Protein backbone atom coordinates (compact mmCIF):
# COMPACT_ATOMS: atom_id res chain seq x y z
CA UNK A 1 0.00 0.00 0.00
CA UNK A 2 2.62 2.52 -1.11
CA UNK A 3 2.11 5.64 -3.24
CA UNK A 4 4.78 7.93 -4.71
CA UNK A 5 4.20 11.59 -5.60
CA UNK A 6 6.02 13.60 -8.27
CA UNK A 7 5.97 17.39 -8.46
CA UNK A 8 6.50 19.53 -11.57
CA UNK A 9 7.03 23.29 -11.51
CA UNK A 10 7.24 25.99 -8.88
CA UNK A 11 3.64 25.60 -7.67
CA UNK A 12 3.83 21.81 -7.77
CA UNK A 13 6.97 21.63 -5.65
CA UNK A 14 5.70 24.27 -3.22
CA UNK A 15 2.51 22.24 -2.75
CA UNK A 16 4.80 19.25 -2.23
CA UNK A 17 6.82 21.18 0.35
CA UNK A 18 3.63 21.81 2.31
CA UNK A 19 2.40 18.24 1.78
CA UNK A 20 5.58 16.63 3.08
CA UNK A 21 5.71 18.91 6.13
CA UNK A 22 2.16 17.80 6.92
CA UNK A 23 3.05 14.15 6.28
CA UNK A 24 6.10 14.30 8.56
CA UNK A 25 4.07 16.01 11.29
CA UNK A 26 1.12 13.60 11.16
CA UNK A 27 3.29 10.49 11.64
CA UNK A 28 5.56 12.03 14.28
CA UNK A 29 8.63 11.97 12.03
CA UNK A 30 11.21 14.54 13.05
CA UNK A 31 12.64 16.72 10.24
CA UNK A 32 16.10 15.19 10.72
CA UNK A 33 14.65 11.94 9.31
CA UNK A 34 14.01 9.68 12.32
CA UNK A 35 11.21 9.24 14.84
CA UNK A 36 11.96 10.24 18.48
CA UNK A 37 3.83 0.96 10.11
CA UNK A 38 1.28 3.47 8.84
CA UNK A 39 4.14 5.56 7.43
CA UNK A 40 5.07 2.89 4.87
CA UNK A 41 2.85 4.52 2.22
CA UNK A 42 5.08 7.63 2.11
CA UNK A 43 8.40 6.93 3.87
CA UNK A 44 10.62 3.95 3.14
CA UNK A 45 12.60 2.65 6.12
CA UNK A 46 16.20 2.91 4.96
CA UNK A 47 18.99 1.32 7.00
CA UNK A 48 17.98 1.67 10.64
CA UNK A 49 16.09 4.56 12.20
CA UNK A 50 15.72 6.56 8.99
CA UNK A 51 12.72 7.51 6.84
CA UNK A 52 12.98 9.05 3.36
CA UNK A 53 9.95 10.30 1.37
CA UNK A 54 8.89 8.59 -1.85
CA UNK A 55 8.99 11.74 -3.96
CA UNK A 56 11.09 13.70 -6.45
CA UNK A 57 11.03 17.48 -6.71
CA UNK A 58 11.85 18.31 -10.32
CA UNK A 59 12.04 21.85 -11.70
CA UNK A 60 13.98 23.95 -14.20
CA UNK A 61 14.84 26.94 -12.00
CA UNK A 62 17.60 25.99 -9.53
CA UNK A 63 16.55 28.83 -7.20
CA UNK A 64 13.63 27.18 -5.42
CA UNK A 65 15.19 23.71 -5.63
CA UNK A 66 18.48 24.59 -3.94
CA UNK A 67 16.68 26.92 -1.52
CA UNK A 68 14.76 23.82 -0.44
CA UNK A 69 18.08 21.94 -0.39
CA UNK A 70 19.48 24.48 2.10
CA UNK A 71 16.23 24.96 4.03
CA UNK A 72 14.58 23.28 7.01
CA UNK A 73 14.45 19.69 5.75
CA UNK A 74 18.02 19.25 4.49
CA UNK A 75 18.46 15.70 5.79
CA UNK A 76 14.85 14.57 5.35
CA UNK A 77 15.01 14.46 1.53
CA UNK A 78 17.42 12.23 -0.37
CA UNK A 79 19.80 14.49 -2.36
CA UNK A 80 19.28 12.67 -5.67
CA UNK A 81 15.49 12.99 -5.40
CA UNK A 82 15.47 16.78 -5.83
CA UNK A 83 16.00 17.04 -9.58
CA UNK A 84 16.94 20.53 -10.77
CA UNK A 85 17.27 21.84 -14.30
CA UNK A 86 19.40 24.64 -15.69
CA UNK A 87 17.19 26.88 -17.85
CA UNK A 88 13.56 27.84 -17.37
CA UNK A 89 10.87 27.20 -19.94
CA UNK A 90 9.92 30.87 -19.37
CA UNK A 91 6.17 30.28 -19.65
CA UNK A 92 6.70 28.50 -22.99
CA UNK A 93 5.09 25.10 -23.53
CA UNK A 94 7.15 24.49 -26.68
CA UNK A 95 10.42 25.34 -24.94
CA UNK A 96 9.85 23.05 -21.97
CA UNK A 97 8.35 20.32 -24.17
CA UNK A 98 10.98 20.12 -26.92
CA UNK A 99 14.08 22.18 -26.10
CA UNK A 100 14.70 21.56 -22.38
CA UNK A 101 12.46 18.56 -21.77
CA UNK A 102 14.53 16.08 -23.78
CA UNK A 103 17.56 16.34 -21.47
CA UNK A 104 15.76 16.38 -18.10
CA UNK A 105 13.07 13.73 -18.62
CA UNK A 106 15.55 10.83 -18.80
CA UNK A 107 17.08 11.53 -15.38
CA UNK A 108 13.64 11.82 -13.78
CA UNK A 109 12.54 8.61 -15.50
CA UNK A 110 15.48 6.45 -14.43
CA UNK A 111 15.23 7.89 -10.92
CA UNK A 112 11.52 7.09 -10.64
CA UNK A 113 12.42 3.66 -12.03
CA UNK A 114 14.51 2.84 -8.96
CA UNK A 115 11.99 4.60 -6.71
CA UNK A 116 9.29 2.22 -7.98
CA UNK A 117 11.71 -0.72 -7.75
CA UNK A 118 12.30 0.09 -4.07
CA UNK A 119 8.55 -0.25 -3.52
CA UNK A 120 6.66 -3.55 -3.58
CA UNK A 121 2.94 -2.68 -3.53
CA UNK A 122 2.84 0.54 -5.57
CA UNK A 123 -0.75 1.75 -5.74
CA UNK A 124 -0.04 4.38 -8.39
CA UNK A 125 1.37 7.79 -9.15
CA UNK A 126 -0.06 11.23 -8.42
CA UNK A 127 1.18 14.42 -10.08
CA UNK A 128 1.25 17.99 -8.76
CA UNK A 129 1.72 20.70 -11.39
CA UNK A 130 0.33 23.98 -12.70
CA UNK A 131 -0.58 24.37 -16.38
CA UNK A 132 -0.07 28.15 -16.28
CA UNK A 133 3.72 27.92 -16.23
CA UNK A 134 6.09 26.46 -18.77
CA UNK A 135 7.98 23.87 -16.74
CA UNK A 136 4.81 22.37 -15.26
CA UNK A 137 2.94 22.33 -18.57
CA UNK A 138 5.79 21.75 -21.02
CA UNK A 139 7.88 18.90 -19.63
CA UNK A 140 5.03 17.67 -17.42
CA UNK A 141 3.25 16.64 -20.61
CA UNK A 142 6.31 14.70 -21.77
CA UNK A 143 6.69 13.07 -18.35
CA UNK A 144 3.03 11.99 -18.40
CA UNK A 145 3.47 10.65 -21.94
CA UNK A 146 6.51 8.57 -21.00
CA UNK A 147 4.95 7.31 -17.76
CA UNK A 148 1.81 6.27 -19.66
CA UNK A 149 3.82 4.41 -22.31
CA UNK A 150 6.09 2.96 -19.60
CA UNK A 151 3.51 1.67 -17.10
CA UNK A 152 0.02 2.31 -18.47
CA UNK A 153 -2.22 0.24 -16.22
CA UNK A 154 -1.31 2.13 -13.05
CA UNK A 155 -3.32 5.07 -11.75
CA UNK A 156 -2.02 8.62 -12.30
CA UNK A 157 -4.00 11.11 -10.22
CA UNK A 158 -3.79 14.65 -11.56
CA UNK A 159 -4.01 17.67 -9.25
CA UNK A 160 -3.54 20.49 -11.75
CA UNK A 161 -4.10 24.25 -11.51
CA UNK A 162 -5.96 26.00 -14.32
CA UNK A 163 -5.73 29.78 -14.74
CA UNK A 164 -8.56 31.65 -13.08
CA UNK A 165 -11.31 33.17 -15.25
CA UNK A 166 -9.88 36.61 -14.42
CA UNK A 167 -6.90 36.12 -12.09
CA UNK A 168 -3.61 35.34 -13.82
CA UNK A 169 0.12 36.01 -13.47
CA UNK A 170 1.12 35.87 -17.17
CA UNK A 171 -0.37 36.52 -20.62
CA UNK A 172 0.51 33.40 -22.62
CA UNK A 173 -1.13 31.00 -20.16
CA UNK A 174 -4.13 30.15 -22.43
CA UNK A 175 -1.77 28.60 -24.98
CA UNK A 176 0.02 26.55 -22.32
CA UNK A 177 -3.31 25.55 -20.75
CA UNK A 178 -4.73 24.27 -24.04
CA UNK A 179 -1.55 22.48 -25.12
CA UNK A 180 -1.36 20.84 -21.69
CA UNK A 181 -5.05 19.92 -21.34
CA UNK A 182 -4.92 18.10 -24.66
CA UNK A 183 -2.32 15.65 -23.33
CA UNK A 184 -4.08 15.67 -19.95
CA UNK A 185 -7.10 14.12 -21.68
CA UNK A 186 -5.72 10.67 -22.51
CA UNK A 187 -2.83 10.22 -20.08
CA UNK A 188 -4.08 10.92 -16.55
CA UNK A 189 -6.68 8.66 -14.95
CA UNK A 190 -8.31 11.06 -12.46
CA UNK A 191 -7.97 14.85 -12.73
CA UNK A 192 -8.78 17.11 -9.78
CA UNK A 193 -9.15 20.80 -10.59
CA UNK A 194 -7.73 23.50 -8.30
CA UNK A 195 -8.14 27.20 -9.06
CA UNK A 196 -6.35 29.80 -6.96
CA UNK A 197 -9.21 32.33 -6.94
CA UNK A 198 -11.57 29.85 -5.27
CA UNK A 199 -9.04 29.16 -2.52
CA UNK A 200 -8.49 32.92 -2.18
CA UNK A 201 -12.21 33.44 -1.61
CA UNK A 202 -12.34 30.47 0.78
CA UNK A 203 -9.58 32.04 2.88
CA UNK A 204 -11.22 35.48 2.67
CA UNK A 205 -14.73 34.43 3.77
CA UNK A 206 -14.23 31.34 5.96
CA UNK A 207 -10.67 31.53 7.31
CA UNK A 208 -10.79 35.38 7.19
CA UNK A 209 -7.19 36.10 6.27
CA UNK A 210 -7.37 39.41 4.41
CA UNK A 211 -3.77 39.12 3.13
CA UNK A 212 -3.16 35.44 2.31
CA UNK A 213 -0.17 34.11 0.40
CA UNK A 214 0.56 30.89 -1.51
CA UNK A 215 1.50 29.22 1.79
CA UNK A 216 -2.11 29.02 3.00
CA UNK A 217 -3.26 27.69 -0.38
CA UNK A 218 -0.55 25.01 -0.29
CA UNK A 219 -1.52 24.11 3.28
CA UNK A 220 -5.16 23.68 2.24
CA UNK A 221 -4.13 21.50 -0.72
CA UNK A 222 -1.95 19.43 1.61
CA UNK A 223 -4.85 19.02 4.04
CA UNK A 224 -7.12 17.88 1.20
CA UNK A 225 -4.64 15.32 -0.14
CA UNK A 226 -3.85 14.08 3.39
CA UNK A 227 -7.55 13.61 4.13
CA UNK A 228 -7.80 11.83 0.76
CA UNK A 229 -4.96 9.36 1.46
CA UNK A 230 -5.83 8.84 5.14
CA UNK A 231 -7.96 5.84 4.14
CA UNK A 232 -4.85 4.05 2.89
CA UNK A 233 -2.76 5.45 5.76
CA UNK A 234 -5.05 4.47 8.66
CA UNK A 235 -7.67 1.79 9.28
CA UNK A 236 -11.24 3.00 9.75
CA UNK A 237 -14.87 1.89 9.84
CA UNK A 238 -15.13 1.75 6.03
CA UNK A 239 -11.97 2.28 3.97
CA UNK A 240 -11.62 2.86 0.23
CA UNK A 241 -8.44 2.39 -1.79
CA UNK A 242 -6.97 4.54 -4.56
CA UNK A 243 -8.49 2.22 -7.20
CA UNK A 244 -12.01 3.01 -5.96
CA UNK A 245 -12.08 6.48 -7.56
CA UNK A 246 -11.79 5.23 -11.13
CA UNK A 247 -14.32 2.51 -10.22
CA UNK A 248 -17.09 4.79 -8.93
CA UNK A 249 -16.34 8.32 -10.20
CA UNK A 250 -15.70 8.09 -13.97
CA UNK A 251 -18.59 6.61 -15.98
CA UNK A 252 -16.48 6.95 -19.15
CA UNK A 253 -12.69 7.09 -19.58
CA UNK A 254 -12.86 10.43 -21.44
CA UNK A 255 -14.72 12.14 -18.57
CA UNK A 256 -12.33 12.51 -15.61
CA UNK A 257 -12.54 16.03 -14.17
CA UNK A 258 -13.37 16.18 -10.47
CA UNK A 259 -14.68 19.14 -8.50
CA UNK A 260 -12.81 19.52 -5.21
CA UNK A 261 -14.35 20.58 -1.91
CA UNK A 262 -13.46 20.47 1.77
CA UNK A 263 -15.32 20.98 5.03
CA UNK A 264 -15.06 22.33 7.60
CA UNK A 265 -12.75 25.16 6.51
CA UNK A 266 -13.11 27.28 9.65
CA UNK A 267 -10.97 29.58 11.79
CA UNK A 268 -10.08 29.07 15.45
CA UNK A 269 -12.60 31.73 16.56
CA UNK A 270 -15.57 30.67 14.42
CA UNK A 271 -15.03 27.00 15.27
CA UNK A 272 -15.97 28.07 18.80
CA UNK A 273 -19.08 29.70 17.27
CA UNK A 274 -20.52 27.07 14.90
CA UNK A 275 -21.22 23.58 16.20
CA UNK A 276 -19.25 20.87 14.40
CA UNK A 277 -21.41 17.90 13.38
CA UNK A 278 -21.45 15.58 10.38
CA UNK A 279 -24.76 16.93 9.05
CA UNK A 280 -23.67 20.56 8.81
CA UNK A 281 -20.18 19.86 7.44
CA UNK A 282 -21.77 17.58 4.83
CA UNK A 283 -24.27 20.31 3.93
CA UNK A 284 -21.45 22.87 3.71
CA UNK A 285 -19.42 20.60 1.40
CA UNK A 286 -21.96 21.00 -1.43
CA UNK A 287 -22.49 24.77 -1.46
CA UNK A 288 -20.97 26.53 -4.51
CA UNK A 289 -19.09 28.91 -2.19
CA UNK A 290 -16.94 26.08 -0.77
CA UNK A 291 -15.55 24.70 -4.05
CA UNK A 292 -11.86 24.72 -4.92
CA UNK A 293 -12.49 25.66 -8.58
CA UNK A 294 -14.63 28.52 -9.90
CA UNK A 295 -17.66 26.71 -11.33
CA UNK A 296 -21.30 26.52 -10.33
CA UNK A 297 -22.73 22.97 -10.07
CA UNK A 298 -26.23 24.50 -10.16
CA UNK A 299 -25.85 25.06 -13.91
CA UNK A 300 -24.73 21.42 -14.22
CA UNK A 301 -25.86 17.93 -13.29
CA UNK A 302 -24.08 15.61 -10.87
CA UNK A 303 -22.89 12.28 -12.26
CA UNK A 304 -21.02 10.89 -9.24
CA UNK A 305 -19.84 11.98 -5.80
CA UNK A 306 -17.13 10.79 -3.42
CA UNK A 307 -17.19 11.53 0.31
CA UNK A 308 -14.21 11.08 2.64
CA UNK A 309 -14.86 11.16 6.38
CA UNK A 310 -12.27 11.52 9.15
CA UNK A 311 -12.55 11.57 12.92
CA UNK A 312 -15.71 11.10 14.99
CA UNK A 313 -17.98 9.70 12.28
CA UNK A 314 -20.24 6.63 12.41
CA UNK A 315 -22.17 5.21 9.41
CA UNK A 316 -25.59 6.21 10.79
CA UNK A 317 -25.14 9.99 10.63
CA UNK A 318 -23.30 10.01 7.29
CA UNK A 319 -26.01 7.79 5.80
CA UNK A 320 -28.72 10.12 7.12
CA UNK A 321 -26.96 13.19 5.71
CA UNK A 322 -26.46 11.49 2.34
CA UNK A 323 -30.17 10.63 2.25
CA UNK A 324 -31.11 14.23 3.08
CA UNK A 325 -28.85 15.60 0.35
CA UNK A 326 -30.24 13.04 -2.11
CA UNK A 327 -33.78 14.24 -1.39
CA UNK A 328 -32.73 17.87 -1.86
CA UNK A 329 -33.88 19.48 -5.11
CA UNK A 330 -31.43 22.40 -5.15
CA UNK A 331 -28.88 20.01 -6.72
CA UNK A 332 -30.04 17.46 -9.30
CA UNK A 333 -28.33 14.23 -10.32
CA UNK A 334 -28.13 12.90 -13.86
CA UNK A 335 -30.95 10.56 -14.85
CA UNK A 336 -28.90 7.50 -15.82
CA UNK A 337 -27.19 7.54 -12.41
CA UNK A 338 -29.82 6.74 -9.74
CA UNK A 339 -27.20 6.54 -6.97
CA UNK A 340 -24.09 8.65 -7.47
CA UNK A 341 -22.68 8.59 -3.94
CA UNK A 342 -19.75 6.79 -2.35
CA UNK A 343 -18.79 7.33 1.29
CA UNK A 344 -15.57 6.45 3.09
CA UNK A 345 -15.05 6.66 6.85
CA UNK A 346 -11.73 6.94 8.69
CA UNK A 347 -11.13 7.28 12.41
CA UNK A 348 -8.20 9.72 12.53
CA UNK A 349 -9.27 13.37 12.16
CA UNK A 350 -6.94 15.79 10.36
CA UNK A 351 -4.02 17.23 12.30
CA UNK A 352 -2.90 20.86 12.52
CA UNK A 353 0.56 22.28 11.81
CA UNK A 354 2.10 25.13 13.84
CA UNK A 355 1.67 28.48 12.14
CA UNK A 356 -1.48 27.26 10.39
CA UNK A 357 -4.93 28.81 10.45
CA UNK A 358 -7.29 25.81 10.43
CA UNK A 359 -8.88 24.94 13.76
CA UNK A 360 -8.41 21.56 15.43
CA UNK A 361 -11.69 19.87 14.53
CA UNK A 362 -13.08 16.48 15.55
CA UNK A 363 -14.37 15.65 12.06
CA UNK A 364 -13.89 16.72 8.46
CA UNK A 365 -15.23 15.99 4.98
CA UNK A 366 -13.38 15.86 1.65
CA UNK A 367 -15.85 15.95 -1.24
CA UNK A 368 -14.94 14.95 -4.80
CA UNK A 369 -17.69 14.93 -7.43
CA UNK A 370 -18.14 14.85 -11.20
CA UNK A 371 -20.38 17.41 -12.90
CA UNK A 372 -20.72 19.31 -16.19
CA UNK A 373 -19.57 22.75 -15.01
CA UNK A 374 -16.08 21.69 -16.11
CA UNK A 375 -17.49 22.16 -19.61
CA UNK A 376 -18.24 25.73 -18.56
CA UNK A 377 -14.66 26.18 -17.31
CA UNK A 378 -13.26 24.86 -20.59
CA UNK A 379 -15.46 27.20 -22.65
CA UNK A 380 -14.53 30.17 -20.45
CA UNK A 381 -10.84 29.42 -21.07
CA UNK A 382 -11.52 28.71 -24.76
CA UNK A 383 -13.08 32.11 -25.46
CA UNK A 384 -10.01 34.01 -24.24
CA UNK A 385 -7.68 31.51 -25.92
CA UNK A 386 -9.42 32.16 -29.25
CA UNK A 387 -9.26 35.91 -28.58
CA UNK A 388 -5.45 35.85 -28.77
CA UNK A 389 -5.07 33.34 -31.62
CA UNK A 390 -7.18 35.44 -34.01
CA UNK A 391 -4.34 37.96 -34.45
CA UNK A 392 -1.54 35.34 -34.17
CA UNK A 393 -0.15 36.94 -31.01
CA UNK A 394 2.90 35.34 -29.35
CA UNK A 395 2.87 32.58 -31.99
CA UNK A 396 6.41 33.38 -33.17
CA UNK A 397 7.78 32.33 -29.77
CA UNK A 398 6.33 28.82 -30.10
CA UNK A 399 7.16 28.35 -33.80
CA UNK A 400 10.82 29.23 -33.28
CA UNK A 401 10.96 26.74 -30.41
CA UNK A 402 10.12 23.79 -32.67
CA UNK A 403 6.35 23.54 -33.15
CA UNK A 404 4.18 25.20 -35.82
CA UNK A 405 0.68 26.62 -36.29
CA UNK A 406 -1.03 23.24 -36.66
CA UNK A 407 -0.76 22.28 -32.99
CA UNK A 408 -2.73 25.33 -31.83
CA UNK A 409 -5.62 24.66 -34.23
CA UNK A 410 -5.81 20.92 -33.53
CA UNK A 411 -5.67 21.46 -29.76
CA UNK A 412 -8.50 23.99 -30.17
CA UNK A 413 -10.46 21.38 -32.13
CA UNK A 414 -9.91 18.75 -29.44
CA UNK A 415 -11.07 21.24 -26.80
CA UNK A 416 -14.23 21.86 -28.86
CA UNK A 417 -14.93 18.12 -29.17
CA UNK A 418 -14.34 17.69 -25.43
CA UNK A 419 -16.83 20.51 -24.86
CA UNK A 420 -19.33 18.75 -27.10
CA UNK A 421 -18.98 15.61 -24.99
CA UNK A 422 -19.61 17.56 -21.79
CA UNK A 423 -22.86 19.12 -22.92
CA UNK A 424 -24.38 16.12 -24.68
CA UNK A 425 -23.48 13.55 -22.01
CA UNK A 426 -25.56 15.37 -19.39
CA UNK A 427 -28.72 15.17 -21.51
CA UNK B 1 -8.88 2.91 -35.10
CA UNK B 2 -9.84 5.72 -32.73
CA UNK B 3 -13.00 7.69 -33.49
CA UNK B 4 -11.73 10.81 -31.70
CA UNK B 5 -8.51 12.53 -32.87
CA UNK B 6 -7.59 12.99 -29.19
CA UNK B 7 -5.53 9.79 -28.98
CA UNK B 8 -3.09 10.81 -31.72
CA UNK B 9 -0.29 13.26 -31.00
CA UNK B 10 0.13 16.67 -32.62
CA UNK B 11 2.80 16.22 -35.28
CA UNK B 12 1.61 12.69 -36.05
CA UNK B 13 -1.73 13.92 -37.41
CA UNK B 14 0.04 16.97 -38.85
CA UNK B 15 2.25 14.67 -40.95
CA UNK B 16 -0.80 12.56 -41.78
CA UNK B 17 -2.57 15.64 -43.13
CA UNK B 18 0.56 16.62 -45.05
CA UNK B 19 0.64 13.13 -46.58
CA UNK B 20 -3.02 12.07 -46.72
CA UNK B 21 -5.87 14.49 -46.05
CA UNK B 22 -8.04 11.44 -46.74
CA UNK B 23 -7.61 9.66 -43.39
CA UNK B 24 -7.14 13.16 -41.97
CA UNK B 25 -10.75 13.84 -42.93
CA UNK B 26 -12.16 10.64 -41.49
CA UNK B 27 -10.62 10.95 -38.04
CA UNK B 28 -12.70 14.11 -37.61
CA UNK B 29 -15.86 12.77 -39.29
CA UNK B 30 -15.69 9.54 -37.27
CA UNK B 31 -17.68 11.42 -34.60
CA UNK B 32 -20.77 11.52 -36.85
CA UNK B 33 -22.47 9.01 -34.53
CA UNK B 34 -25.73 10.41 -33.20
CA UNK B 35 -25.41 8.90 -29.72
CA UNK B 36 -22.57 10.39 -27.68
CA UNK B 37 -22.70 7.49 -25.22
CA UNK B 38 -22.07 4.99 -28.02
CA UNK B 39 -19.08 7.03 -29.20
CA UNK B 40 -17.81 7.12 -25.61
CA UNK B 41 -18.10 3.32 -25.46
CA UNK B 42 -16.09 3.03 -28.69
CA UNK B 43 -13.49 5.41 -27.26
CA UNK B 44 -13.33 3.23 -24.15
CA UNK B 45 -12.87 0.16 -26.35
CA UNK B 46 -10.02 1.71 -28.36
CA UNK B 47 -8.29 2.97 -25.20
CA UNK B 48 -8.68 -0.49 -23.67
CA UNK B 49 -7.18 -2.13 -26.76
CA UNK B 50 -4.26 0.31 -26.67
CA UNK B 51 -3.71 -0.52 -22.99
CA UNK B 52 -3.86 -4.24 -23.82
CA UNK B 53 -1.14 -3.65 -26.42
CA UNK B 54 1.11 -2.32 -23.65
CA UNK B 55 2.78 -4.84 -21.35
CA UNK B 56 2.55 -5.13 -17.57
CA UNK B 57 5.40 -4.08 -15.28
CA UNK B 58 6.26 -5.86 -12.04
CA UNK B 59 6.83 -3.67 -8.98
CA UNK B 60 9.15 -6.00 -7.05
CA UNK B 61 12.44 -5.67 -8.92
CA UNK B 62 14.44 -4.67 -5.82
CA UNK B 63 13.89 -7.22 -3.07
CA UNK B 64 14.17 -5.76 0.44
CA UNK B 65 14.92 -8.03 3.40
CA UNK B 66 14.77 -6.93 7.02
CA UNK B 67 17.95 -7.58 9.02
CA UNK B 68 17.93 -7.99 12.80
CA UNK B 69 21.23 -6.16 13.44
CA UNK B 70 22.41 -5.54 9.83
CA UNK B 71 25.40 -7.88 10.14
CA UNK B 72 26.20 -10.87 7.94
CA UNK B 73 27.52 -12.89 10.87
CA UNK B 74 24.25 -12.53 12.79
CA UNK B 75 22.04 -13.17 9.75
CA UNK B 76 23.95 -16.29 8.69
CA UNK B 77 23.87 -17.88 12.15
CA UNK B 78 21.56 -20.81 12.78
CA UNK B 79 20.85 -21.55 16.46
CA UNK B 80 22.49 -24.69 17.82
CA UNK B 81 20.26 -27.63 18.72
CA UNK B 82 20.59 -27.44 22.51
CA UNK B 83 17.67 -28.85 24.49
CA UNK B 84 17.22 -30.02 28.06
CA UNK B 85 13.87 -31.51 27.03
CA UNK B 86 12.63 -34.77 28.51
CA UNK B 87 13.18 -37.75 26.23
CA UNK B 88 9.87 -39.46 27.05
CA UNK B 89 7.00 -38.48 24.77
CA UNK B 90 4.40 -39.43 27.38
CA UNK B 91 5.64 -36.76 29.79
CA UNK B 92 4.42 -34.06 27.41
CA UNK B 93 0.74 -33.12 27.54
CA UNK B 94 -0.59 -33.57 24.00
CA UNK B 95 -4.16 -33.84 25.29
CA UNK B 96 -6.51 -32.91 28.10
CA UNK B 97 -5.80 -35.04 31.21
CA UNK B 98 -7.92 -38.19 31.28
CA UNK B 99 -8.84 -37.66 34.94
CA UNK B 100 -11.17 -34.68 34.51
CA UNK B 101 -12.70 -35.97 31.28
CA UNK B 102 -15.96 -37.80 31.79
CA UNK B 103 -16.02 -41.56 32.51
CA UNK B 104 -18.24 -42.73 29.63
CA UNK B 105 -16.30 -40.39 27.34
CA UNK B 106 -13.06 -42.05 28.42
CA UNK B 107 -14.68 -45.46 27.92
CA UNK B 108 -15.73 -44.99 24.31
CA UNK B 109 -12.54 -43.00 23.63
CA UNK B 110 -10.71 -46.18 24.65
CA UNK B 111 -13.17 -48.18 22.54
CA UNK B 112 -12.25 -46.32 19.36
CA UNK B 113 -8.60 -45.81 20.37
CA UNK B 114 -6.78 -48.07 22.86
CA UNK B 115 -3.27 -46.81 22.14
CA UNK B 116 -3.19 -43.15 23.12
CA UNK B 117 -5.53 -43.97 26.00
CA UNK B 118 -2.94 -46.45 27.28
CA UNK B 119 -0.23 -43.82 26.84
CA UNK B 120 -2.19 -41.21 28.80
CA UNK B 121 -2.86 -43.73 31.58
CA UNK B 122 0.85 -44.60 31.56
CA UNK B 123 2.72 -41.30 31.05
CA UNK B 124 6.14 -42.75 31.86
CA UNK B 125 5.94 -45.69 29.44
CA UNK B 126 7.69 -45.20 26.09
CA UNK B 127 7.52 -48.52 24.22
CA UNK B 128 4.39 -50.21 22.90
CA UNK B 129 4.88 -53.38 24.95
CA UNK B 130 5.00 -51.32 28.16
CA UNK B 131 1.81 -49.36 27.45
CA UNK B 132 -0.20 -52.37 26.22
CA UNK B 133 1.23 -54.62 28.95
CA UNK B 134 -1.64 -55.14 31.41
CA UNK B 135 -4.18 -53.21 33.45
CA UNK B 136 -2.83 -54.99 36.53
CA UNK B 137 0.93 -54.46 36.12
CA UNK B 138 0.84 -50.79 37.17
CA UNK B 139 -0.51 -49.86 40.59
CA UNK B 140 -1.69 -46.49 39.27
CA UNK B 141 -4.03 -48.24 36.82
CA UNK B 142 -6.55 -49.24 39.49
CA UNK B 143 -7.76 -45.67 40.30
CA UNK B 144 -8.27 -45.05 36.59
CA UNK B 145 -9.97 -48.44 36.17
CA UNK B 146 -12.50 -48.01 38.97
CA UNK B 147 -13.04 -44.36 38.04
CA UNK B 148 -13.93 -45.33 34.46
CA UNK B 149 -15.80 -48.53 35.36
CA UNK B 150 -13.27 -51.04 34.00
CA UNK B 151 -13.34 -54.31 35.92
CA UNK B 152 -9.95 -55.65 37.04
CA UNK B 153 -9.70 -59.44 37.55
CA UNK B 154 -8.00 -60.40 40.79
CA UNK B 155 -4.41 -61.60 40.87
CA UNK B 156 -3.32 -60.10 37.55
CA UNK B 157 -0.55 -60.74 36.98
CA UNK B 158 0.56 -61.20 40.56
CA UNK B 159 -0.74 -60.10 43.93
CA UNK B 160 2.54 -58.46 44.93
CA UNK B 161 2.69 -54.95 43.40
CA UNK B 162 5.77 -54.96 41.18
CA UNK B 163 7.07 -56.13 37.80
CA UNK B 164 7.75 -52.93 35.80
CA UNK B 165 11.57 -52.76 35.96
CA UNK B 166 12.16 -50.79 32.75
CA UNK B 167 9.73 -47.94 33.43
CA UNK B 168 10.33 -45.75 36.48
CA UNK B 169 6.93 -45.62 38.19
CA UNK B 170 5.87 -45.71 41.82
CA UNK B 171 8.71 -46.69 44.13
CA UNK B 172 10.65 -48.73 41.55
CA UNK B 173 12.73 -46.24 39.59
CA UNK B 174 16.09 -44.50 39.47
CA UNK B 175 17.35 -41.79 37.11
CA UNK B 176 20.15 -42.87 34.74
CA UNK B 177 22.08 -39.76 35.78
CA UNK B 178 24.89 -40.10 38.30
CA UNK B 179 23.18 -38.61 41.40
CA UNK B 180 20.46 -41.24 41.57
CA UNK B 181 17.30 -40.31 43.53
CA UNK B 182 17.92 -36.77 42.23
CA UNK B 183 19.10 -33.56 43.90
CA UNK B 184 22.71 -33.26 42.72
CA UNK B 185 24.34 -29.94 43.62
CA UNK B 186 28.09 -30.69 43.56
CA UNK B 187 30.55 -32.65 41.46
CA UNK B 188 30.91 -35.16 44.30
CA UNK B 189 27.37 -36.47 43.80
CA UNK B 190 27.33 -35.75 40.04
CA UNK B 191 25.38 -32.48 39.54
CA UNK B 192 22.74 -34.30 37.45
CA UNK B 193 25.36 -35.34 34.87
CA UNK B 194 25.85 -38.91 33.60
Amino acid sequence: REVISIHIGQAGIQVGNACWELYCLEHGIQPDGQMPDAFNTFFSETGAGKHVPRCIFLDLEPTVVDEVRTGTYRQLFHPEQLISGKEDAANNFARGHYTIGKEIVDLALDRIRKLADNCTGLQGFLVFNAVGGGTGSGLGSLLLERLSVDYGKKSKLGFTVYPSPQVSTAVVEPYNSVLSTHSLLEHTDVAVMLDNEAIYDICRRSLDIERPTYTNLNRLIAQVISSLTASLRFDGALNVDITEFQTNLVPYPRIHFMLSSYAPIISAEKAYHEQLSVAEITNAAFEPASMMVKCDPRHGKYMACCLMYRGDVVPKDVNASVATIKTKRTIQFVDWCPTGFKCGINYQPPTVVPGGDLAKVQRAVCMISNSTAIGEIFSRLDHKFDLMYAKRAFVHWYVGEGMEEGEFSEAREDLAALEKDFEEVGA
Amino acid sequence: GPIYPSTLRYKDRLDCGKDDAFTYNRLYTATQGSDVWARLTVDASVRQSSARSRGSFQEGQAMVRHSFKNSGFDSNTCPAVLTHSTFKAGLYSYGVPIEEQHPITARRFKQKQPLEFMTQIRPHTETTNQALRMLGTYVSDQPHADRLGMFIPAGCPGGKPAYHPDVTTGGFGLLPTLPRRGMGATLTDGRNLK
Binding site: Q34, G47, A48, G49, K50 | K69, N70, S71
Partner: peptide, 15 residues
Protein backbone atom coordinates in the same frame (compact mmCIF):
# COMPACT_ATOMS: atom_id res chain seq x y z
CA UNK C 1 21.31 9.47 16.72
CA UNK C 2 23.05 7.04 14.36
CA UNK C 3 22.66 3.31 13.65
CA UNK C 4 24.26 0.98 16.19
CA UNK C 5 26.54 -0.77 13.68
CA UNK C 6 28.21 2.54 12.81
CA UNK C 7 28.34 4.17 16.27
CA UNK C 8 30.61 1.41 17.62
CA UNK C 9 32.02 -0.45 14.62
CA UNK C 10 35.45 -1.32 16.04
CA UNK C 11 34.60 -1.18 19.75
CA UNK C 12 35.40 -4.66 21.07
CA UNK C 13 35.02 -6.08 24.56
CA UNK C 14 37.87 -8.39 25.55
CA UNK C 15 38.12 -10.45 28.74
Amino acid sequence: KLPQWVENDRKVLRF
